[PDB]
A paper describes a structure:
H+,K+-ATPase contains two subunits—the α-subunit, which transports the ions across the membrane, and the β-subunit, which helps in membrane targeting and regulation of protein conformational equilibrium. The α-subunit contains ten transmembrane helices that constitute the ion-binding site and three cytoplasmic domains. In the lumen-facing state of the pump (E2), the pump selectively binds K+ despite the presence of a 10-fold higher concentration of Na+.
The E936Q mutant exhibits both Na+ activation and reduced apparent affinity for K+. Mutation of E936Q is introduced on the background of the previously reported Y799W mutant, which induces luminal gate closure. Indeed, when the two structures were aligned according to their TM helices, the RMSD value of the respective region was 0.38 Å, indicating that the structure of the cation-binding site in the transmembrane region is very similar to each other in the two mutants. In the Y799W crystal structure, E936 located at the TM8 makes a hydrogen bond with D824 in TM6 (2.8 Å), while the E936Q side chain is slightly further away from D824 (4.0 Å) to form a strong hydrogen bond in the Y799W/E936Q mutant structure. A speculative explanation is that the change in the hydrogen bond between E936 and D824 alters the position of TM5 where D824 in present, which subsequently affects the rotamer conformation or position of the E820 side chain, which is also located in TM5 and involved in the K+ coordination.
Numbering used by the authors:
A (entry chain A): 47 to 1033
B (entry chain B): 29 to 290
Amino acid sequence: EMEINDHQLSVAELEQKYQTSATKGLSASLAAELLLRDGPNALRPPRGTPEYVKFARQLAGGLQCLMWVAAAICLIAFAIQASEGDLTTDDNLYLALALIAVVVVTGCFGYYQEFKSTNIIASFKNLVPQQATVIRDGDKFQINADQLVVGDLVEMKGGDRVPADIRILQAQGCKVDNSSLTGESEPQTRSPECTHESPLETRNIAFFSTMCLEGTAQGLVVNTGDRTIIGRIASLASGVENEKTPIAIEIEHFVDIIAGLAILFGATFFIVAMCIGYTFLRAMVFFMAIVVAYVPEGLLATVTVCLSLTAKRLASKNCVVKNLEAVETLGSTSVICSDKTGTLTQNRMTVSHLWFDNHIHSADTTEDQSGQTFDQSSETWRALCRVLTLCNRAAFKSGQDAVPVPKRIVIGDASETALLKFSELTLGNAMGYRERFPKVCEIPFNSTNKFQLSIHTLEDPRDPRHVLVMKGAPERVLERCSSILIKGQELPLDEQWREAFQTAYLSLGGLGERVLGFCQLYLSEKDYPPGYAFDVEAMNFPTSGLCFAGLVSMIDPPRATVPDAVLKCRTAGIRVIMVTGDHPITAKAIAASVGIISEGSETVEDIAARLRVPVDQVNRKDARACVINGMQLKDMDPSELVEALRTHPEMVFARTSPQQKLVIVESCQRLGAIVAVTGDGVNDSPALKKADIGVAMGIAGSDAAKNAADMILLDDNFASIVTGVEQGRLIFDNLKKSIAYTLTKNIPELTPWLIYITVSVPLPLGCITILFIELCTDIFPSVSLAYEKAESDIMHLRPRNPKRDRLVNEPLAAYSYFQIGAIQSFAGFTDYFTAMAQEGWFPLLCVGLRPQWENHHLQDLQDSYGQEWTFGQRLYQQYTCYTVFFISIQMCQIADVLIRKTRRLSAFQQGFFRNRILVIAIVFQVCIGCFLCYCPGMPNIFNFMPIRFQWWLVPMPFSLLIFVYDEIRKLGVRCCPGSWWDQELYY
Amino acid sequence: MLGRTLSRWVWISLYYVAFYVVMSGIFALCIYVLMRTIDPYTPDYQDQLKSPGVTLRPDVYGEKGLDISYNVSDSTTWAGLAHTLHRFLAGYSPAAQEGSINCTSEKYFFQESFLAPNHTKFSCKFTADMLQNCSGRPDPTFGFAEGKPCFIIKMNRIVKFLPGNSTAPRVDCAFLDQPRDGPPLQVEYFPANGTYSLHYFPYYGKKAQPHYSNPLVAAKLLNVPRNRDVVIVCKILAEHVSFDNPHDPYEGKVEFKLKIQK
Ligand SMILES: CCCCCCCC/C=C\CCCCCCCC(=O)OC[C@H](COP(=O)(O)OCC[N+](C)(C)C)OC(=O)CCCCCCC/C=C/CCCCCCCC
Ligand SMILES: CC(C)CCC[C@@H](C)[C@H]1CC[C@H]2[C@@H]3CC=C4C[C@@H](O)CC[C@]4(C)[C@H]3CC[C@]12C
Ligand SMILES: *[C@@H]1O[C@H](CO)[C@@H](O)[C@H](O)[C@H]1NC(C)=O
Ligand SMILES: *[C@@H]1O[C@H](CO)[C@@H](O)[C@H](O)[C@H]1NC(C)=O
Ligand SMILES: *[C@@H]1O[C@H](CO)[C@@H](O)[C@H](O)[C@H]1NC(C)=O
Ligand SMILES: *[C@@H]1O[C@H](CO)[C@@H](O)[C@H](O)[C@H]1NC(C)=O
Ligand SMILES: *[C@@H]1O[C@H](CO)[C@@H](O)[C@H](O)[C@H]1NC(C)=O
Ligand code: ALF
Ligand SMILES: [K+]
Ligand SMILES: [K+]
Ligand SMILES: [K+]
Ligand SMILES: [Mg+2]
C-alpha cells in the first residue's frame, strides 16, 4: 500500500482500484468515509519524552546515587541523634542539605549539557501546503490539503506545492523540482507516461510538499499524510534512537569506575570499623564520610563548563552546536559521509570549461573569483564572448550593483543565469553590451527549434550590417554549421575538424558537464534592410551555413575551501565518503575534483576500459575507487555493502534516497566507527539525525536539515569541519588533563578519614572542608586547563580507537590517585603533625587519642607537656588541623595544576605563563584560601582557623617534589619513546 | 593475565613499592626533624590556651551537661560521690606528695635553673588536709550526709601561665539565676576565702615538674534549698583569667546543676 506501484497501472485499473473516476472524481460521502477511515492528509508528530522527565533522569547516575545515599545517611544520623537530645550535631543536617544542593546543581548542569534547541517537527510542518484544488462530483472547489483521501482529483496550478502523492492523469507543460527528495533543484517534467520502473524516477508521479514550478496538471491522489514519500522521510527523521555521544559514553565509563571504587572503599572500611569495635551508627557515618571524601563533587560540572568554553570558542569561528556534547564528537570521528549539492558544491551552475581555438580552456569557478583564469587574448575568444553575451534571455534584478556577481539574483534558467554571470565576470557589463546590440529578430527556446537564435544590429552606427547569433545543443549546432573559427579566421569544416569537435564534446561531457554549442553568422544589409519586418512566424530567418564559435560547458562547481578541507580531513585519518542524490557522472567528477577520489585512483569500469576487458574479469581489489548508484545499492545485501566498503577506500554513492543514505550511515556505524554527516537538505535530515555528529550548512541548509543537525556552519566555509576536528581532539586532551587534576585531590581527603578510623588520631579533615575544596577552591584551576594548547600536531594523528582509547583509563587513574595523591596526603599529614606538635600534642600521644579527645565529659585532658585542655579548646585545635590539611592540599594542587598543563612536553617548553587563565585561576585560588583562613567568624561558621605561616610553608617542599617528579617522568617518556617507562608511566 | 602479564605485574608492583618506601622515608625524616626542633620543656605556641579551664569533683554528667542529684535520706545515692571524692584526694594524700616541697613564699615561684633531683624544677606541696573540713578526714561523707556537699574546684594548668599577682586567684560560687525572694548562695571556702596560693604558679611542665599538683579549693555549699533544681556557677576571679566565652562553657568557670532530695 505504502509502496507505490500505481505508475505501472493503467487509468482504468487505477479507477477500479481507488473506486474513483478520472473526470468526475469522488462523491462527498465516500470522500468523508475514506477521510474517517484513513485520517487527515497531515504529518502526525511523534511526541518525545518531556523535559521534566529528562531533568529527573539527570538526577540519577553513579555519583548522583552515591550523593543521595550520603545525604540519606546524614539525615538518618541527625534524626537519631536529635531524638537523644544531642542537638550539637547540626553539622549532619547542614551536610545533608549541601549534598542535596550539589545533586540538584549537578543535575542542572547535566540537563544543560544535553539540551537541544531544535524542533524538527515544525520544519516538516511548514513544508505542507494548506490549499488543494479538488474536483468532487464535479463543481471544482478549493479546500484545505488535510481533507484529501487516497484516490481523488486535484489540479496542479503552477506556483503551488503538491498537496499529496499524486499520479498525473493529464499534464500541460507541468514542471516540478524534487528537491526534498533528491537534493537537486533542477526542474523535472511531469507527464502522464510511465518513463521508469521506479516511482521515484517516473514522470507520472508528483510528490507531497514539492513545488510546481510552472504549468498546469491534473492527477489522482495516491498517498496521503505519513504514507507519502515526504511523510516517510519525516517519520524516519523523527523516529531515530537518541544514541549516546562518545563523550557521554566516556563520562559514563569513568563515572562507573569512580562509583565502583567508592563502593569498594566504603564497604571494606565499614566492615573494618565494625570489626575493630564501633557502633553501626558510627560505621554508617564513616561510610558516608568515606563516600563524600572520595567522590568528586564537582567533576561533572567542570566537564560541562569545559564543554561550554569549547562551544564558545567554536562559535567564535562561525560554528554553532545545538548541544554541548557536539563540541567533541567531530574529533575522534573516523568517517565523514558528505552530501554533494550545496554542501561540497555551491548549488549554482557555473561556466567551467570552454572549447575554442582547438584547445580546451578552464574557467575560474570559485565563488570569490580567486582561482586561475584562462587566456582571453584571442579574436576567436572575443567572437565567442560576443555570441554568448548576445544569446542571453536572462533578466537581472535592479539594485544589485553592490552584490557580488556570483551571488546576484537572476531571473532566468540555470544555464542562462550561468552564461550571463560568466559574461558579467569576463566582459565589463553584460546588460550594457546587450543594450548596444539591439536584436531585430529573436527565436526563443520555446519548442521544435532545439536552439536559441537572434539577429542583432552592430553597435557602430556607421555599419548597417546585422550579426546573427545561435546557441543550442552541440550536435544540432554542428549539423547546421559549415565552418569553424580558428585563430580569428573562418576555416571550412572538414573531417579532421569534425572529429576534433566530437572528441572535445565527448571529453567535456564525460566530466558531468552541460555542454552548449555556440555559433554565429555575419549577415548583410543587402539580404535584409535595417527596417525589415523580422516576423518569427514568417520563417524568413535562413538559419543555414553558420560558423562555429566554440563549446561552453557548465557544472555545479565545488566551493573554494572544499578541496583543501577534504585533503586536511584525509590527512587527519578520516575517511570521506560521498553520498549524493545526483547522477553518477557528475558525482564522480565532483568527487575527483574535491579530492574524495585521489589522482591516479581508478574504478573497476576505468580499469576495464583501459585494459579493453569486460568488467567481470577485472579484479575488484585493483580498483581504489568505486561508484555505486541507488539501484545496485538496493539490490545489494548488507554483507555485500560492507564488503564493498572494506574493498574500496574511496567510495561514492550516487542517486541515493534518504533511506539509502540512512542505510549507508548505519552500515558505517555498525563497524564500530564514529560517523559524521554533512548535508543541507530534507533528504539529508534522516542521515543527519542518525549520525553521531550531524553538520548542516547555514545559508544553503534547509530548515529540516538545520533542525536535524546538531552543528550548523554559519558561513558555509566547510573548513569549519577541520576546525571542529582540531578542537574536538584538543578538548579530549584537555579534558583528560582536567579530570586528572580533579581526581588527584580526592586521595588526600580520603586518607585522613581512613587514618582517623584505623589509628584513632583526632580528626584531621572535615566534610565541610572537603566540600569547600571540591566546590569552591579548585573548580576554576581545573576549568582553566581547557585553554591548553596542543603539545603535538594533532591534525596529523589518526582518530582514536573508541574501544581502546578512553577519556579516563587505568594509567591516568593510577598515576593521579596513587603517585600524586600519596604525596599530597604525606604533605597534609606532615603539616598536621607539625601543627599538633607546636601546640603540645606529640605524634605518639596523638596515636589513639581520639576517644579521649572527643569526650565531652573530659575537660582536663593533658597534652605532652602536662597542660590540661577543655573540650572546646581541643575542638579549636581540631579546626586548626582542618585548616592546616586544607592549606597543604591547596599548595599541592597549585603544583598539580602546574604539572597537568602537559602530558608529554615540559613545562619549560610549553611555557609557564602562556595560559593567562591558568595564572588568574591560581591567584584566585590562593586569594580564596587566604580569605577563608583569615576572615573573622570563620572558626565558628566554617571551622577555618587563622594559621601561622610555617604551616603555609611546610607543604611547599612536597609541592616542589611533585613538580620535579612529574618533570622527570615526562623527560624519561620523551627520551625513551618505546620503553617500559613510556609503556607504564605515561597517561 | 588480567590487564597485563605476570612479569609486568611484578615490575609495576616493585616500582610502586620503591615509590612508597621512598615517600615513607621522606615522611619519617620530616617527623624526625620536627621532633628535633620541638622544645622538650616549653610548648612553641599556646594559641588555644589563652585562659585555663575549670573542672570540679564529683563530676557526675548528664547528657546536656554537669548534673549532680542525690537524696539525704538514701545512702545509696551518696556512696558514689563520696567514693569519687576519696579516690580523687588519694592523689593528694601526704604520702603521694613526697616529691614536692613545702612552700611559704605566697608569691610567684619563679625558677630559672633545674635544682631539684632528676635535673628538674621544684614543685610545691598541696596536701588534702589543707581542705580542713571538706578534706574528708574528720567527716568521711564530705558534707553530703547533712545536705552541705563539698565540691573540689581546680583550674587547668598551663605552662608559664600567670593569673595575676596583685592578689591570689579566687573561687566565687553563686546561683546562675538569682532568685528574687530566695536568699543568695552561702558558701564556706577551704582554704580561707578559697584562694590558690601564688607559689603554685607558674607551672613549668611535666618534664620540669613531674610531681606538680594542682592546688585545690573546696566549696562547702551551706544554703541550698531541698527538692529544687538549682544551678551553681563557680568562676575564678583572677586578673588574667576570663570566663566570658560563649563557645567554651568551662573556660574560667564551671557550671553544674544540683538537686538535693529529701
Ligand atoms: C599503602 C601504603 C601506606 C604507607 C603509609 C606510610 C607508613 C610509614 C609512615 C609512618 C610510619 C611511622 C614513621 C615514624 C617516623 C618517626 C621518625 C622519628 O624518629 O621520630 C621520633 C618520634 C619520637 O619522638 P619523641 O617522642 O622522643 O620526641 C620528644 C620531643 N623531644 C625530643 C623534643 C623531647 O617517633 C614518633 O613520633 C613515632 C610516631 C610517628 C607518627 C606516626 C603516626 C601514624 C600516622 C600515619 C599517617 C600517615 C599517612 C600516610 C598517607 C599515605 C597516603 C597514600
Ligand atoms: C607499598 C606497601 C606499603 C604495601 C604493598 C601492598 C601491595 C600489595 C599493593 C599496594 C599498592 C598496590 C598497587 C597500587 C596501584 C596499582 C596500579 C593499578 O593500575 C594496578 C594495581 C596496582 C599495581 C596495585 C597492586 C597492589 C599494590 C602493589
Ligand atoms: C529519699 O529516700 C527516702 C527513703 O529513705 C524516700 O522515702 C524519699 O522519697 C527519697 N526522696 C525523694 C523525695 O525521692
Ligand atoms: C628521680 O628523683 C626521684 C626523687 O625522689 C628519685 O626517687 C628517682 O630515683 C630519680 N630517678 C632518676 C632516674 O633519677
Ligand atoms: C568543719 O569542721 C570544723 C572543725 O570540726 C568546724 O569547726 C566547722 O564548723 C565545720 N564546718 C562546717 C560548716 O561543717
Ligand atoms: C608581680 O610580678 C611582677 C613581675 O612580673 C613584679 O614586678 C611585681 O612586684 C609583683 N607584684 C606583687 C604584688 O608581688
Ligand atoms: C581571707 O582569709 C583571711 C584569714 O586567713 C581573712 O583574714 C581575710 O579577711 C580574708 N579575705 C577576705 C577577702 O575575706
Ligand atoms: F543536496 Al543532495 F543528495 F546532493 F541532498
Ligand atoms: K571529594
Ligand atoms: K545526529
Ligand atoms: K546518533
Ligand atoms: Mg544538498
